[PDB]
Structure 1
Amino acid sequence: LWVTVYYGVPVWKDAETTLFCASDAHNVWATHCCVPTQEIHLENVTEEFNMWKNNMVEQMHTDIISLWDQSLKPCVKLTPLCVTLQCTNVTNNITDDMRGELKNCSFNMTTELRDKKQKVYSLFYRLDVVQINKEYRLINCNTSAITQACPKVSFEPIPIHYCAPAGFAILKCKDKKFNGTGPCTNVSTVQCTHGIKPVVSTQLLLNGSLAEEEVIIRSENITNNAKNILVQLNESVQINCTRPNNNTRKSIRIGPGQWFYATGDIIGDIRQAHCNVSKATWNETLGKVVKQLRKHFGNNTIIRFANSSGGDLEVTTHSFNCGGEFFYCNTSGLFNSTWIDSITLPCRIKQIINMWQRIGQAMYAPPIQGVIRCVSNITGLILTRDGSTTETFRPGGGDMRDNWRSELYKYKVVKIEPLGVAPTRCKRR
């Protein structure tokens, strides 16, 4: 027998590379994912997948942080804004739940000429100020610069697709009950991932993919209480969120081409922001989650759901960003049951945002005029388990990689190496 050389051989190795972003043709993602956007079944291929070690997740995480920072990098800083504020209560046609939530603050700030100053006022939410010595300063003035987000820039998530560079391919696992790690016996090759919306939230994962047959419970180690449980639902739960106050925007010149966008006066009555979850739907949804948890924790085990505990209102609440506004909603009205017409969740609003658990940076979110309505789909949950016949589950969050693992779990990147040899009966002459 003789060595025969073959080129174009259908083989591969696991690999880590840089994927590029493509989209479906002033949004950040639309601007970045400039490349515009089939599937090949691989019969008898049984490849091994590992969600918890998937490099595509780290790439997505890095791309989000980088774009966010590049987006804010050229925007006006609010350094000249942190002066002592003189604040009083907003008491005009305000309900009871809102008393003390809003303050009317006046202060001495700069103008376009170096020798001039102006007295201006703005409204602030209680969560954005620090009382001193009534006199206030903004949160984070003495620890970081606060950058105002540009009002023209949209952070609305749009679907994005990750695509392999030439020489690489993405393998997709089609096993309907795949639990993140292990062998997959139904594999296909794709050029790009499905459209993934880079939605940022805690506790409840919004606008993702649904499971096709049953609720799927995924964990790196289901028996390790230090790890999170990602729960993918097989139907969505619709959640209706709003910020009912008709607001205004007050543009203040702070320098030569530099503007600050202050919260202006509120038109009409002042009410608390909130989210509505259908009650029957939520109850049935948890019953399904519980059946699947029993498969790991015992069919005679008591399963309890309880709310969050420690941490700031970044993780103890359901954080989300819709309509350009940042909401921190109370989910204790959802995670309150023991297993053997609507639920209203009150919400808090903040303008000074510390993204991705960093402490040296902050963003100021300009006010949004009018009234905000958002309708979202709950597609999954993040649960944690308490550390002998009863188990207790609580909402989790904070580490964004776990949100992106809920979509990038079916995909693996491999490198194609189309060259090899094998014995044959031919001889070159």
Structure 2
Amino acid sequence: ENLWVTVYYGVPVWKEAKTTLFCASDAKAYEKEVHNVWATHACVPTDPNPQEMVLKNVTENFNMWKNDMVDQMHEDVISLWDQSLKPCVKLTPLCVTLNCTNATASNSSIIEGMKNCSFNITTELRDKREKKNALFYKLDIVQLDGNSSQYRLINCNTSVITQACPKVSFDPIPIHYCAPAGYAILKCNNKTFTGTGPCNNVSTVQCTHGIKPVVSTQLLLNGSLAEGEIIIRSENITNNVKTIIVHLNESVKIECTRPNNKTRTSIRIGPGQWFYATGQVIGDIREAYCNINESKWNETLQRVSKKLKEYFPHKNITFQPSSGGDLEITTHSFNCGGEFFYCNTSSLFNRTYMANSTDMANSTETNSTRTITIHCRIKQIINMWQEVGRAMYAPPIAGNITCISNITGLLLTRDGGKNNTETFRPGGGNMKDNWRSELYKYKVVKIEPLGVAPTRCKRRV
């Protein structure tokens, strides 16, 4: 019996294949008159089409980190910044000095950050430039002179100086990253949940369901929930330093808004230009005062330890505090309302909660809840996109900026090893690891519809 050759067309095969994606957006989040900015510009609309054609005989394998779309999740917003960059104002093109210790303010403000200044060595050396209120917001006062410092303008020695103004858009728009036909995205979803070995429930989708990606240093707030169970992933389990992703079947908040109500005192200094001294008098007790109901908080953590058991059998869990450097790593960062979050989260990740066969040594919430409170930082000049040397000033604003929302996962790292006492430090690490959340359910391929096999039959000749 011979082996001739034969060809087949329309046959089912798809390739593991890198490709790069367009973004689909809500075309009424932005609006018709707000031309010439990234979301109104190159990002296209959306028309959702879940169409999840189910698959016996699928057998694909996965790793969370083999994906390339993670890079697009760090890209894009540089164009949102650049298409919107406000210039250096005439008061600020050089390292001017400022003098204060108590605040330049209308009142004895009971807020630690508004230690406001005059401008002093200032362009013309003229009262019209100097006497203007340099509103402070804690992260200020770069030292110049060794005593009684005439503080340096902190932005003057980095490549970008720029301003946030209330007209300039920011919004967590629902976004989808997508690629044309013949390519397909495969979503994988066996309750035996994987992203790591084989899979057993799969179908194509034209794009992911929408996601609202925004940065954090500790807590995956407003993330997509898991279901049935908590889960953890961290690549080669012999590894110490490389990030552990913790993902939740329940959720809990962090109890503060952005409460610091302030006046609309912008100063129209320079030719069609501004400084936003928007501070003083109104709300001058309203520091961020963040708080913790231990019950639901500790419950989720102790549940997480009862999962960590599975990765570290018959030995007892513990935690250690987060890193310094930029105190964002010690705290948080996120934007809401143009205002940024920096309360002492590292105060929480603590005790030696036991994993012996135990009915104790796993709680502090006391059923009384205690409603504990923690010290908070603030910043008016922000590193507007992380790692990069850029800096931007942003105004404090009137009323309550209400974001106080819920957590669906943790950034986590191990701290070496010792006999029985396994332990971890929360947050920090690769800021790309935020986007690994949920995206593990998806990967992209190219269809390749033709092929060949041997056979026991021959063409006419």
Normalization by structure 2: what TM-score? 0.83
- Percent of aligned positions that are identical: 71
1:99-142 Cα distance to aligned partner (Å, 9 max, x none): 4x32121226679xxxx856411311121232322522233422
1:187 aligns with 2:202: yes
Amino acid of the structure 2 residue aligned with 1:77: C
Structure 2 residue corresponding to 1:147, chosen from 152, 158, 162? 162
Aligned counterparts of 1:295 and 1:239: Cα–Cα separation in 2: 28
- Residue 23 of structure 1 corresponds to 25
Deviation larger for 248-257 or 198-207 = 248-257
> What displacement does 1:352 show?
1.4
Structure 2 stretches lacking a partner, 5+ long: 31-36, 355-368
- Supply the distance in 1 between the matched residues of 2:63 and 2:91 (Cα, whole angstroms): 49
Greater CA deviation, 206-215 or 344-353?
Answer: 344-353
User: Partner residue of 2:15?
Assistant: 13
* Partners of 1:68 and 1:162 in 2: CA distance: 17
Of 322, 328, 331, which aligns to 1:314? Answer: 328
Which position in structure 2 is the counterpart of 1:35? 45
Give, as a single letter, the amino acid of the residue that structure 2 aligns with 1:45.
V
Is 2:381 the partner of 1:370? no
Describe how 1:209-248 pairs up with structure 2 within 5 A.
209-248=224-263
Answer whether contact 1:251 1:261 (CA < 8 A) is retained: yes
Partners of 1:237 and 1:3 lie apart in 2 by 62
Deviation at 1:383, TM superposition (A): 0.9
1:399 aligns with 2:430: yes
Aligned to 2:96: 83
1:51 aligns with 2:82: no
**Which whole-Å deviations, capped at 9, do the CAs of 1:127-159 have from their partners, x for residues lacking one?**
123232252223342233321134322222122
Q: Which moved more, 1:322-331 or 1:2-11?
A: 2-11
Structure 1 or 2, whichever has the larger Rg, is 2
Amino acid at match of 1:9: V
Select which of 141, 146, 149 maps to 1:129: 141
- Taking the aligned partners of 2:385 and 2:4, their CA distance within structure 1 comes to 59
User: Which residue of 439, 443, 447 maps to 1:412?
Assistant: 443
- For 1:56, the aligned partner's letter is M
- In 1, the alpha carbon distance for the partners of 2:321 and 2:407 equals 17
Which segment drifts farther, 414-423 or 284-293? 414-423
User: In terms of mean alpha carbon deviation, does 171-180 or 10-19 score higher?
Assistant: 171-180
Counterpart position of 2:352 = 338
- Does the aligned pair in 2 maintain the 1:78–1:145 contact within 8 Å? no
Aligned residue for 1:103? 115
With 204-213 and 52-61 compared, the bigger mean Cα shift is at 52-61
TM-score for the superposition, normalised by structure 1: 0.88
1:252 offset after TM fit, Å? Answer: 2.4
Residues 326-377 of structure 1 show CA distances to partners (whole Å, capped at 9, x for unaligned) of 1112113321222112343332111211245435321222332333221312
Shift, 1:196, TM fit: 1.1
Once residues 241 and 385 of structure 2 are traced to their aligned partners in structure 1, the CA distance between those partners, rounded to angstroms, is: 20
How many Å apart are 1:413 and its aligned residue? 0.8
2:362 match = none
Equivalence map 1:151-166=2 (5 Å): 151-166=166-181
Q: Distance in 2 between matches of 1:79 and 1:349?
A: 26
Instruction: Between 47-56 and 170-179, report the one with greater CA deviation.
Output: 170-179
Matched residue type, 1:21: C
Q: CA deviation at 1:219?
A: 0.3
Q: Across the two proteins, how many residue pairs are aligned to each other?
A: 419
SS of match in other structure, 1:287: helix
Determine the C-alpha separation between the residues in 2 that align with 1:416 and 1:53. 19
Task: Name the SS for the 1:304 alignment partner.
Answer: strand
Deviation of 1:292 (Å) = 1.0
Q: Which moved more, 1:28-37 or 1:49-58?
A: 28-37
Secondary structure of the corresponding residue to residue 319 of structure 1: coil
2:306 to 291, 295, 306: 291
Any idea what SS the aligned residue of 1:194 has?
Answer: coil
Q: Which has the higher helix share?
A: 1
* Residue of structure 1 equivalent to 2:282: 267
C-alpha contact 2:323 2:329 (8 A) present in aligned 1: no
**CA displacement, residues 155-203 of structure 1 (integer Å, 9 cap, x when unaligned):** 2212211112232111111123434322212211111112111121111
Structure with a larger share of its residues in strand: 1
Q: Which runs of 5+ in 1 are unaligned?
A: none
Q: Tell whether the 8 Å contact from 2:289 to 2:374 is kept in structure 1 after alignment.
A: yes
Cα displacement (A) at 1:284: 0.6
CA, structure 1 residues 166+120, in 2 after alignment: closer, same or farther (shift >3 Å)?
same
Task: Give secondary structure in 2 for the equivalent of 1:166.
Answer: coil
